Structures are given as C-alpha cells and as structure tokens.
Amino acid sequence: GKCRGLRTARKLRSHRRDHKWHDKQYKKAHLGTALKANPFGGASHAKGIVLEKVGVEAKQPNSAIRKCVRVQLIKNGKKITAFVPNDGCLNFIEENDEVLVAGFGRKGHAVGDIPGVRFKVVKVANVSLLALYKGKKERPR
Amino acid sequence: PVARSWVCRKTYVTPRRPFEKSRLDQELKLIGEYGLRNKREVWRVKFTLAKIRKAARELLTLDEKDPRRLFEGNALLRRLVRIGVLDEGKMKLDYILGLKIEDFLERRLQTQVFKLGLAKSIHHARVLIRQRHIRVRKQVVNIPSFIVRLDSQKHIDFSLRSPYGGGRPGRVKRKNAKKGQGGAG
Amino acid sequence: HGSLARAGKVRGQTPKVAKQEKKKKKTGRAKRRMQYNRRFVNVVPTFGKKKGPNANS
Amino acid sequence: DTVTIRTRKFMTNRLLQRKQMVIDVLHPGKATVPKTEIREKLAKMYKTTPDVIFVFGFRTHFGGGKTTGFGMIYDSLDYAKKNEPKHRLARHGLYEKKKTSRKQRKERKNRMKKVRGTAKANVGAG
RNA sequence: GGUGACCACGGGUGACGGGGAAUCAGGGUUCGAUUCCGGAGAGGGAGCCUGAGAAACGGCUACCACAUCCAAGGAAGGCAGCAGGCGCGCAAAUUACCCACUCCCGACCCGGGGAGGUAGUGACGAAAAAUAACAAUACAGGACUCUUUCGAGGCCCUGUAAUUGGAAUGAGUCCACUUUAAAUCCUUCCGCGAGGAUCCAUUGGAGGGCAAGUCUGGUGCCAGCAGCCGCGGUAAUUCCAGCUCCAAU
Numbered sequence: 001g002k003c004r005g006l007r008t009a010r011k012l013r014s015h016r017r018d019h020k021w022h023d024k025q026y027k028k029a030h031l032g033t034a035l036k037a038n039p040f041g042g043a044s045h046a047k048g049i050v051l052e053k054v055g056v057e058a059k060q061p062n063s064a065i066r067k068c069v070r071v072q073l074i075k076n077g078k079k080i081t082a083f084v085p086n087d088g089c090l091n092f093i094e095e096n097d098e099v100l101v102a103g104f105g106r107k108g109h110a111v112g113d114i115p116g117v118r119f120k121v122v123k124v125a126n127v128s129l130l131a132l133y134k135g136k137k138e139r140p141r
Numbered sequence: 142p143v144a145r146s147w148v149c150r151k152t153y154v155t156p157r158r159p160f161e162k163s164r165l166d167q168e169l170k171l172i173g174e175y176g177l178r179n180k181r182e183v184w185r186v187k188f189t190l191a192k193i194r195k196a197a198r199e200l201l202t203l204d205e206k207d208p209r210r211l212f213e214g215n216a217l218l219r220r221l222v223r224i225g226v227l228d229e230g231k232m233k234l235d236y237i238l239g240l241k242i243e244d245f246l247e248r249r250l251q252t253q254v255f256k257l258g259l260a261k262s263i264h265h266a267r268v269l270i271r272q273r274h275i276r277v278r279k280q281v282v283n284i285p286s287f288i289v290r291l292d293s294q295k296h297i298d299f300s301l302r303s304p305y306g307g308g309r310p311g312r313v314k315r316k317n318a319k320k321g322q323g324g325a326g
Numbered sequence: 327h328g329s330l331a332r333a334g335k336v337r338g339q340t341p342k343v344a345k346q347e348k349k350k351k352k353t354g355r356a357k358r359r360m361q362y363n364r365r366f367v368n369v370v371p372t373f374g375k376k377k378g379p380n381a382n383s
Numbered sequence: 384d385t386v387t388i389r390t391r392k393f394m395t396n397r398l399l400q401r402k403q404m405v406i407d408v409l410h411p412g413k414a415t416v417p418k419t420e421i422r423e424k425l426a427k428m429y430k431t432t433p434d435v436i437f438v439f440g441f442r443t444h445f446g447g448g449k450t451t452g453f454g455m456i457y458d459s460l461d462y463a464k465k466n467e468p469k470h471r472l473a474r475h476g477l478y479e480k481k482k483t484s485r486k487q488r489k490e491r492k493n494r495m496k497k498v499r500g501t502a503k504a505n506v507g508a509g
Numbered sequence: 510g511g512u513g514a515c516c517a518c519g520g521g522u523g524a525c526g527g528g529g530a531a532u533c534a535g536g537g538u539u540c541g542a543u544u545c546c547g548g549a550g551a552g553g554g555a556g557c558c559u560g561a562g563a564a565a566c567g568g569c570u571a572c573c574a575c576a577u578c579c580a581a582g583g584a585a586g587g588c589a590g591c592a593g594g595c596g597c598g599c600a601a602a603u604u605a606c607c608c609a610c611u612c613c614c615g616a617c618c619c620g621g622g623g624a625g626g627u628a629g630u631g632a633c634g635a636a637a638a639a640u641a642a643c644a645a646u647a648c649a650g651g652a653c654u655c656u657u658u659c660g661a662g663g664c665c666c667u668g669u670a671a672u673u674g675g676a677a678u679g680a681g682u683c684c685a686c687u688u689u690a691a692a693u694c695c696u697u698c699c700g701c702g703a704g705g706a707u708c709c710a711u712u713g714g715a716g717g718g719c720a721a722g723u724c725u726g727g728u729g730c731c732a733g734c735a736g737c738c739g740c741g742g743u744a745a746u747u748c749c750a751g752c753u754c755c756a757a758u
C-alpha cells in the first residue's frame with residue numbers, strides 16, 4: 001500500500017513526482033518535444049505561404065476528397081497540410097497567397113476524417129474565409 | 142505607475158450545466174414574472190444571493206459568543222432588513238439560508254413601481270424608470286435594478302419635472318398641441 | 327489523386343432564393359416578454375401529448 | 384427667483400487671508416448656473432463685492448435640481464493676486480500669461496546650450 | 510580539510526525574486542515578465558574618472574560587437590526616458606496637450622520635470638444599461654358568473670393584426686451652461702429630433718452529448734457535413750438552400 005507515515009513527506013512528494021513522467025498529458029506539456037515538434041511553436045495560429053493545393057482522401061468508412069493546402073510557415077519554414085474548411089472555399093485560395101492557419105480543436109490529433117491534418121485555414125490575404133464564403137468581403141486585388 | 146483604480150470584478154456567474162431545460166424553464170418565469178432586461182440579470186441576483194448564503198454559512202461553522210459571529214452577523218442581518226427582506230427582527234442568521242431569489246427581485250425599483258400603483262403593467266415600470274419619470278426622495282432615478290432601502294419605499298413618486306407629476310408636457314403632446322394652434326388655428 | 331474541379335459544386339448549382347421581408351423582430355427585453363408569454367401564461371391549453379415548439383401540425 | 388445659494392463648511396482661514404466654503408446651488412428646470420451670476424449673487428451675500436470671490440468645482444447631478452461646488456473669498460484683491468493660482472485670476476480678465484506653447488520653449492532651451500555664453504546668440508534664440 | 514543520496518556535485522528553465530490570480534465542496538494546480546515591495550542591466554564586458562553617495566551609461570576609455578557626417582586629413586553613434594519607425598513577428602496606442610493636481614531638485618513661493626496629469630487610439634478586460642410602453646378596437650383565447658350544451662355578463666385575461674389612437678422617451682443634432690488649463694468627455698438644458706418600408710441585433714446552432722422542426726427546395730459516398738458519436742450512394746430530421754425555433758444575446 002501507501003507509505004502513510006508522519007515523517008514521510010518526501011517519500012510521498014518524490015513518489016507523486018516521478019509517477020507523473022507516466023502521465024501522458026504532462027509529458028506533452030513539461031518535457032520539451034511539443035514546443036520542439038509542433039510547427040506552431042507553442043503558438044495559437046501562424047502565418048504561412050500557400051505552396052500548392054492538395055486533395056486528401058478521407059478515411060475508409062467515409063469516401064470523399066477533402067481539399068487542403070500545403071503551407072510553409074514563415075517563422076520555421078516548416079511545412080503543413082491545412083484543410084480549407086467549408087464548401088467551395090479552395091476555389092478562393094490561389095497559390096502563393098499568405099494564409100493564417102489555426103489549429104483544428106484536437107490540438108495535435110487529426111480531426112475525424114482528413115487523415116493526418118491538424119491545421120485549418122482561417123484567413124487569406126487579410127480577409128478571413130468566413131467573410132468570403134458569406135460574400136461580405138470580396139477578394140483583394 | 143499612474144493613479145487609477147482596477148479592483149474590477151464580475152457581478153455574476155454563468156451556469157455550468159449549460160442548458161438543463163429545468164433551469165431555463167425556471168429562469169424564464171423570473172424574467173416574465175418580473176419584467177427583466179435579459180437572462181444575466183437573474184444570475185446577477187443569483188450570484189449576489191450565493192455570496193450572502195456563503196457569508197452566512199461561513200459564520201455557522203464558528204462557535205457562538207465569538208466576537209466575529211455576533212458582529213458580522215448583526216451587520217449582515219441589518220443589511221438585509223435595511224433593504225426589506227428579513228422582517229421585524231427575524232435577525233438570527235440561520236434563517237438567512239432559507240431565502241430565495243424572488244426576494245432581491247421584489248425589492249428592485251421596477252417591481253416597486255407597480256407594487257405602488259404608479260406604473261400600470263410591469264414593463265411601464267422599467268420604461269418609466271429609464272425614461273427619467275420617477276424619482277426617489279429627491280434624486281431622479283434612471284435604474285430599474287436599484288434595490289430599494291425599506292425606509293425609502295414611501296418616497297417613490299412621479300418626478301417634479303416630468304409630464305405626469307407636472308410641468309412641461311412632453312414633446313409629443315407639445316407637437317400635437319402646436320398642430321392645433323399653428324396648423325389648425 | 328483526385329480532381330479539384332469539384333470544389334464548390336453544390337453552392338454553385340443550388341438555386342438561390344430571396345430572404346423576403348416582413349417583421350423587424352422585437353428584441354432585447356420585449357423579445358423575452360413575447361417568449362414567456364407565448365409559452366407560459368397564455369396558451370397553456372389542454373395538453374395534446376407533449377408540445378412541439380418548432381414542430382409541425 | 385428660484386436659485387437659493389446655500390453654503391456649507393465655512394472656514395475662516397486666517398493664514399491664507401480667506402473665507403472658504405462649499406457652494407450648494409439649488410436650481411429647478413433652469414439649467415446650471417454660470418459662475419458670473421453666482422459670484423454677484425454670492426457678493427451681496429457676504430457683502431464683499433463680486434471682485435473678490437473665486438469659484439471652480441461646480442458639479443451638477445441627476446434631475447437638475449441641485450449642483451454642488453467650491454467658491455471662496457479673500458479680504459482684498461491685493462491678496463487674491465498672491466494667494467490664488469493663475470487659472471482662477473485668468474478665468475476673468477485680470478491676469479493672463481505668455482503663449483509660447485511648450486515645444487517652442489523646449490526647442491529653444493535645447494539650443495542656447497549649443498551656443499556658449501555670447502548673449503547675442505542666446506538672444507538670437509528662436 | 511568541507512559536501513553527499515535528509516540526494517550534494519553535475520545538467521536544464523518558455524526563471525529577474527517576493528507581495529498576489531483564476532481557478533476553485535475540503536486538499537491542491539498553474540500563473541505571477543502585471544502599477545506595490547525587493548533585486549539586476551543599459552548591445553557586451555572591462556576599466557575608469559567624478560562624486561556622500563556611482564564602478565554611475567540622457568559621461569567617458571578602449572576593446573569587442575553596432576552603426577552617422579567627410580573637404581579621405583578626420584569626425585561625431587547609443588530609445589531596456591517619452592513620442593515615432595523598422596524587423597521580428599498569431600499578437601499590442603499619438604512625432605497630441607500641459608505643469609492645473611502629487612511630488613522632486615535647486616541658491617528656490619518665482620523653473621523644470623514625457624517623473625506625472627489631460628486628451629487621442631483602444632470588443633485587453635469589468636459595471637450600468639435603450640433596441641419600446643400603454644389604452645381602445647378587431648379579434649385569438651382561458652380561471653368567476655350565467656348557460657344541459659350552443660350561447661352570454663363580465664370583474665380576469667393574453668395571441669396576433671388595424672396601428673385606431675395619441676402619450677412617453679431617449680440614439681442623434683445643437684441654442685446655452687458647467688468642466689477644465691483650454692478643451693474634451695461627463696453631469697444641466699433651451700430648440701429640433703419614432704408609425705416601420707423605421708432610428709433595422711448576430712452567431713452559432715436546430716439527430717445526441719445539448720435547449721431547437723422525420724417543415725419545404727437542390728445534390729445524390731459528389732460536393733460536402735461532423736470537436737466525439739455520425740450523415741451523404743434518388744423522399745438527408747446530417748450536405749447546399751427556404752421558411753419556423755433556440756441560446757445567449
């Protein structure tokens with residue numbers, strides 16, 4: 001069982017210390033790796049240049065082509081696929097155009113279908129897809 | 142470095158279990174029952190009461206005849222009678238706990254506009270109070286949700302400077318009067 | 327693989343419609359009056375096996 | 384007709400050579416009061432002429448029934464042009480100041496160090 | 510000789526230290542570069558004068574590291590003061606006005622203070638709080654009373670409409686005043702300023718978790734949806750649309 005004694009404040013502290021390098025959710029957060037690995041250098045979103053448009057094939061049970069963008073981030077020069085959300089919006093984005101890419105909500109998990117795509121596009125040439133696909137702000141020229 | 146204030150803190154709490162139904166179906170009554178501005182305005186009073194009840198409950202853990210309990214208690218109770226919730230000297234604390242929202246609503250100005258005839262339907266009240274028609278004592282009050290001190294109940298009255306109360310008929314009646322003098326006469 | 331031609335097939339060919347106009351909807355606190363009133367005090371009729379606040383007849 | 388200027392908190396400041404108190408102006412639907420009227424109506428009040436009364440502060444509050452503020456009274460204009468600050472004398476045409484305007488000063492006075500001590504060039508100035 | 514698994518020594522930090530913060534049944538957990546206290550550094554180090562008091566950077570001495578003018582001999586460079594710009598960047602304000610408040614230095618009541626205050630920018634954030642109310646109708650109803658019911662008296666009601674109707678007000682605009690330093694802003698008020706077609710509330714949703722339609726169009730494993738569960742292959746409660754509703758607002 002547990003150690004339970006009265007001058008055992010350390011055997012306890014030091015017990016509950018190491019038996020966190022067996023937690024998963026902290027070994028992301030406190031180790032290093034994460035900051036080192038995620039192209040998003042601990043940063044909520046990030047800007048990057050659209051280097052080409054790529055359709056991705058969804059995971060078996062749901063057949064469809066997902067319509068994403070290969071990005072290269074400015075700060076790193078680290079590359080990316082980001083699924084351009086909402087219908088017919090890939091149609092908006094052209095090559096070499098500067099996009100603000102944010103996460104998906106799973107923080108590292110790829111979302112649902114879109115096998116291995118953490119990132120979603122938000123803005124395009126200082127616009128925001130939400131404004132374009134609503135037809136509020138037009139494409140700049 | 143600068144002068145200035147800070148110490149800004151919220152007046153409310155949002156619910157956890159975000160839409161129960163049961164909770165919505167209570168909190169709506171409250172909005173209609175008394176013509177409330179919005180939903181938040183409940184969980185203002187909801188948050189304020191929960192303070193009191195936790196202040197009270199803080200005291201119920203203390204031993205009796207202990208300088209704090211006696212002092213903070215009276216002070217706290219007085220503060221409630223003062224605004225007209227506990228009555229007559231109910232004033233012994235445990236009782237505070239048995240007390241619900243309805244109360245710090247019933248003593249909002251808005252309610253005590255039609256409770257004292259004055260308005261004519263609950264929403265008049267909230268209009269009338271905003272419209273700078275009613276006064277308290279001498280100040281003209283703009284605010285619906287001013288909790289009325291029990292003392293200052295009898296001094297809620299149609300402002301001296303407003304159309305009903307007297308002086309300067311408002312611009313609508315002034316214009317449809319000047320239509321009869323200028324336009325017709 | 328995959329043809330990116332089909333981006334925006336559907337918004338593309340769905341026939342658009344007018345959004346109409348009637349009532350500038352009442353808002354703020356009057357909304358909430360209209361709300362309570364229309365599903366608390368007013369109608370509250372003989373029950374017809376549960377409601378359907380946005381359901382059909 | 385309806386103004387009724389009632390005062391609060393009068394002090395005989397022997398050592399600033401003054402009388403000083405909170406002005407409490409009542410006023411009904413008619414709007415604020417100007418400081419000229421209030422001076423002349425506070426003059427016959429204590430019988431000191433309007434000349435020797437200085438008023439600032441004045442803050443009205445809802446309904447327009449009432450407006451508080453601070454006014455005060457020296458025993459001669461000679462002292463008032465001494466104990467009183469500039470803005471309150473300059474408030475009414477008795478003592479004004481230069482209009483060089485701050486950055487003209489600064490631009491000048493950061494020159495005149497460049498030049499040594501040849502007054503002619505310091506007088507050169509801007 | 511001294512220290513050591515009561516963990517030293519070694520390494521790391523997305524570490525200036527406290528005072529606190531949001532979270533929170535009790536216990537913690539992370540954050541505290543954040544105005545208050547304490548420390549440090551003025552590209553980096555070192556050394557210096559001078560000074561009570563400094564190893565002082567709105568001093569200087571080199572060096573290193575930066576960089577300006579040039580008559581090519583030479584010369585002047587330090588925003589981690591305030592403003593501003595560039596670069597970096599997911600990510601942050603005006604070459605604004607002033608010593609009037611609080612305070613400080615001076616030889617000093619008298620100058621100066623980007624210390625500081627005041628404006629501007631400013632969904633960092635917190636408070637209050639409009640976006641309509643009411644009478645009569647037309648009705649649409651439902652507790653007394655009256656009727657076997659159908660009907661009616663009506664104290665009760667409430668739905669939509671006619672807006673029938675005038676009353677009330679602010680958002681604006683703008684005489685005037687206060688404010689302040691001069692404003693501004695606020696508070697005060699003259700004068701104008703509500704019948705929607707206006708003075709026009711949006712963002713997500715509408716299978717479930719989860720409050721809200723097997724309403725109606727279109728597509729038909731495509732487009733697309735879907736944080737998870739999932740839907741889409743010819744009536745989709747799931748896509749794109751229309752109408753209705755819900756949550757906060």
Ligand SMILES: [Mg+2]
């Ligand atoms: Mg590092």
Ligand SMILES: [Mg+2]
Binds near residue numbers: 552
């Ligand atoms: Mg630097």
Ligand SMILES: [Mg+2]
């Ligand atoms: Mg130093």
Ligand SMILES: [Mg+2]
Binds near residue numbers: 566
């Ligand atoms: Mg140095």
Ligand SMILES: [Mg+2]
Binds near residue numbers: 567588
């Ligand atoms: Mg400097």
Ligand SMILES: [Mg+2]
Binds near residue numbers: 600601
């Ligand atoms: Mg920001």
Ligand SMILES: [Mg+2]
């Ligand atoms: Mg400043």
Ligand SMILES: [Mg+2]
């Ligand atoms: Mg806010």
Ligand SMILES: [Mg+2]
Binds near residue numbers: 640
């Ligand atoms: Mg509006």
Ligand SMILES: [Mg+2]
Binds near residue numbers: 717719
């Ligand atoms: Mg759902």
